[PDB]
Amino acid sequence: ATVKVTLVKSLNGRLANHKACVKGLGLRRINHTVEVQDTPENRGMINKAYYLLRVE
Amino acid sequence: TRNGRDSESKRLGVKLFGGQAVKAGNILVRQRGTKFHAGYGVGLGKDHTLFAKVDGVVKFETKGAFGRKYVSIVA
RNA sequence: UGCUUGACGAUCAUAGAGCGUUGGAACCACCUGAUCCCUUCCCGAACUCAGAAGUGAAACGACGCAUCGCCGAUGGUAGUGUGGGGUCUCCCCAUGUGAGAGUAGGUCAUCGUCAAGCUC
RNA sequence: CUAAAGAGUAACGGAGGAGUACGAAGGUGCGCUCAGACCGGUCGGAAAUCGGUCGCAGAGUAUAAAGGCAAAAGCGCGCUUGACUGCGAGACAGACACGUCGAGCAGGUACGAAAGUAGGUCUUAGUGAUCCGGUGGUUCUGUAUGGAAGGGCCAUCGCUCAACGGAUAAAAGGUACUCCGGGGAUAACAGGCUGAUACCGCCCAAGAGUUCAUAUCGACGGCGGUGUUUGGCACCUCGAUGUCGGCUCAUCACAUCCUGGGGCUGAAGCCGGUCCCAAGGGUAUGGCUGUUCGCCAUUUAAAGUGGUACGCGAGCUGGGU
RNA sequence: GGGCUCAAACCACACACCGAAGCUGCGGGUGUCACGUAAGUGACGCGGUAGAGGAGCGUUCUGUAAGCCUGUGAAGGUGA
RNA sequence: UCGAAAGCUAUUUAGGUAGCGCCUCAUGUAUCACUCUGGGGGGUAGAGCACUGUUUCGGCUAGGGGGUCACUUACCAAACCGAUGCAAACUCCGAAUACCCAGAAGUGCCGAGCAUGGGAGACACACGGCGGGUGCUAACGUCCGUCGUGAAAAGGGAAACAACCCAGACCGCCAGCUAAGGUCCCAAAGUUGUGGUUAAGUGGUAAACGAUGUGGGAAGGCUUAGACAGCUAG
RNA sequence: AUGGGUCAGCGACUUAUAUUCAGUGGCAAGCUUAACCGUAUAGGGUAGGCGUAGCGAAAGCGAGUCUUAAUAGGGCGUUU
Ligand SMILES: [Mg+2]
Ligand SMILES: [Mg+2]
Ligand SMILES: [Mg+2]
Ligand SMILES: [Mg+2]
Ligand SMILES: [Mg+2]
Ligand SMILES: [Mg+2]
Ligand SMILES: [Mg+2]
Ligand SMILES: [Mg+2]
Ligand SMILES: [Mg+2]
Ligand SMILES: [Mg+2]
Ligand SMILES: [Mg+2]
Ligand SMILES: [Mg+2]
Ligand SMILES: [Mg+2]
Ligand SMILES: [Mg+2]
Ligand SMILES: [Mg+2]
Ligand SMILES: [Mg+2]
Ligand SMILES: [Mg+2]
Ligand SMILES: [Mg+2]
Ligand SMILES: [Mg+2]
Ligand SMILES: [Mg+2]
Ligand SMILES: [Mg+2]
Ligand SMILES: [Mg+2]
Ligand SMILES: [Mg+2]
Ligand SMILES: [Mg+2]
Ligand SMILES: [Mg+2]
Ligand SMILES: [Mg+2]
Ligand SMILES: [Mg+2]
Ligand SMILES: [Mg+2]
Ligand SMILES: [Mg+2]
Ligand SMILES: [Mg+2]
Ligand SMILES: [Mg+2]
Ligand SMILES: [Mg+2]
Ligand SMILES: [Mg+2]
Ligand SMILES: [Mg+2]
Ligand SMILES: [Mg+2]
Ligand SMILES: [Mg+2]
Ligand SMILES: [Mg+2]
Ligand SMILES: [Mg+2]
Ligand SMILES: [Mg+2]
Ligand SMILES: [Mg+2]
Ligand SMILES: [Mg+2]
Ligand SMILES: [Mg+2]
Ligand SMILES: [Mg+2]
Ligand SMILES: [Mg+2]
Ligand SMILES: [Mg+2]
Ligand SMILES: [Mg+2]
Ligand SMILES: [Mg+2]
Ligand SMILES: [Mg+2]
Ligand SMILES: [Mg+2]
Ligand SMILES: [Mg+2]
Secondary structure (H helix, E strand, O other), X not given: OEEEEEEOOOOOOOOHHHHHHHHHOXXXXXXXXXXXXXXXXXXXXXXXXXXXXXXX | OOOOXXXXXXXXXEOOOOOOEEOOXXXXXXXXXXXXXXXXXXXXXXXXXXXXXXXXXXXXXXXXXXXXXXXXXXX
């Protein structure tokens, strides 16, 4: 499938690998939405940084 | 009577973990005694250094009648 | 066809220990003797040699038994990564993870190569 | 150990060791298995040597601890010198300099019948760069030439250079007679944070109080408050924030010394004790001492306790410091 | 702080709204890549001390310059 | 345009310097990060008592001490048995994380990686969270690990308030939506809605301990064979 | 905490010689001169410097060389 992911919280002051999880999904700024393939590798980045994202 | 002395850290321990490619001569374990024992293709140094005698991948195994942890090199 | 015995392994206690029963045809052990090879900081005890009168007593092998040992869940609990919160020496919530102990229970192993005998 | 299950990781953190030893305590082949307990046994006893059972590493391993140890890495015996020479794939460790491990090749050995094992010791401490000088080798160099000297190369010796990356071959103090450059990076004063300590209050109540815990006290313990003493820290100030005491002038708090109002009393009265309320006003003079204080004398209704840069030196003093 | 008590407090739930230089909109500049052998388009960027890198302004003198400007007013000064 | 450090090691060194770490530029070269899956070692949190120490009961029993002076125990106590606790320098056990390696998708602002070279700065750090030592689990204390912020970061919130919360400012706009935090007035936005609690201005500072404050819940005793309280009498 | 009463003027990364790296030029297996000469920024002067070969302490050997008993391993070098 394919899932809509939107960054809703700022990346300032997060852990480095949480930022790399948001950066690894293609997200650049707050309220920016990407379309990533619903794959286990992409899901693990969404699950790690769930508190920063809005997934729908 | 008092304290304040210590010796330098010896940088002991496992250098190559299970499934890592090894060349012959590669040091696998630095240890004080034989916490790990030399299995197939693995040599033992004066100071009980475990080193590779053949090329392959590290395999850690516990086996034998004494429950010794062995370091072996497999293909 | 399978069994028994012996040697060597796999594995290293769910495999061990203890207790009890059993095996001498062969194998093995105990056994006989010591001049010969060889041995004892003394001693044929062990090691070694030449044997087969005696015995399965010891040991060993097999079989049985949860007394010990060993193995051991499920559930819960403790801890804990991340995010958040409180009354912030310490805790809680969401999510992920998850023991140790203990409990129910389990175990008197399993497999391979070769040689001899027997069985079918 | 701290050290947070890879490595590493500080403190004038918590504990111990080293500055060696061994030609056997190294190598190898062969062989063996401790400590302790119990029983029996001449001296012999808790414990000596001997025999038996249990024991299964609780012993040993030159030495501190930790990690190891059955192919024992522990113990004995025979023969030995591999505690060899050149090296060295490849790694670990690491700022550098140093450091660690090492298969394998060649030469030459030792032990074993042989496969094999041996480049020191169960491992991790036992150490000191360069310069300079000394000694043994050397096919190198040799200031015209041949030599030599001297130099190079290889081997090796001389540092508690221990402040151990070692300034020199060679080195202690005084300064209130002091001086410069700096620092609030760092002390003394005051401020700040904190509150161990201090002071004040409370909780429990064994006990004292003739009996009677709580009129008055109250052990053993516990909980607070204040900022208030002795401290802790080092945040402000070292291109300067004047110190103790006195004098003058104060201002605030209340945990009240007098006066005012009360409850309880082990309160007959007079006088007290304790607690609650109350901050309006008041709240000594001298001797000694620089004293604050204190002791003393004599008063007073009383001679309060604190904060205010231990109030107050661009207001005085200068006795102390 | 005023003031507040069937709160303007506390507990629970819900729907609104306010709120930044965050995000979006509109206009502009600039950096780096890519496409462009072009003007330019596209994407992503553009807080900053020590410090590194890049690109400029202005002043005096020399050449260009025996030129050019200048008493129909130079430099300087003072306003727009 | 990019953009640190206040670390390690050494230093007659400690407020200096040097190599490495971290910044920048250039050249070259192909790695790197996140996640998933798979392969590893560990001895921490927790736990435990199998070892080493340290506990407390009880049972049984040496041995020691009394009465004899050959027998029996007034009194202590080894071991063992059972129950029961503790430990940074205890461990029969033992996570989560973190770390090492391999393979794989997408995303990297066009690059992350590495190498070589030119130029540095820096080697006084501070606070907050978490794990610790130390201190009194005192200090805006001190010393480590680790992350975040400040340093070198403006804006909004926390009254004011480096280090906390939200968020990272290229410029302009008299446009809109949100974050933290808020919405009676100061002062932008609910004197919003629903159901409760509080009466202390608690809210809007604190403990042991004390109390018929008040709300909810689950039980129990006595009770119209007279409960509790009051009154009369014994 | 420091410094500055204000204004105007002055006031601090320079220069020489050696050198390394970068950029940009000349020439190129060569490149370049110094002193000096020179009717003199020309031209000459090529002594010297760097490069074209390395290894070794060195004698020396040389695309090899050093270590070594070793033509084995290894070090550095050689394919510009
Ligand atoms: Mg015999
Ligand atoms: Mg029998
Ligand atoms: Mg279990
Ligand atoms: Mg379990
Ligand atoms: Mg560690
Ligand atoms: Mg760790
Ligand atoms: Mg005896
Ligand atoms: Mg005895
Ligand atoms: Mg030994
Ligand atoms: Mg001569
Ligand atoms: Mg000589
Ligand atoms: Mg030193
Ligand atoms: Mg004098
Ligand atoms: Mg001075
Ligand atoms: Mg200071
Ligand atoms: Mg002070
Ligand atoms: Mg001050
Ligand atoms: Mg001043
Ligand atoms: Mg009062
Ligand atoms: Mg008064
Ligand atoms: Mg009046
Ligand atoms: Mg007096
Ligand atoms: Mg007088
Ligand atoms: Mg004063
Ligand atoms: Mg004054
Ligand atoms: Mg005066
Ligand atoms: Mg809105
Ligand atoms: Mg706005
Ligand atoms: Mg913006
Ligand atoms: Mg735009
Ligand atoms: Mg920005
Ligand atoms: Mg900028
Ligand atoms: Mg002029
Ligand atoms: Mg930037
Ligand atoms: Mg020195
Ligand atoms: Mg624990
Ligand atoms: Mg990986
Ligand atoms: Mg320093
Ligand atoms: Mg420092
Ligand atoms: Mg620090
Ligand atoms: Mg501090
Ligand atoms: Mg400090
Ligand atoms: Mg600074
Ligand atoms: Mg702010
Ligand atoms: Mg404000
Ligand atoms: Mg309003
Ligand atoms: Mg309303
Ligand atoms: Mg209040
Ligand atoms: Mg009644
Ligand atoms: Mg001044």
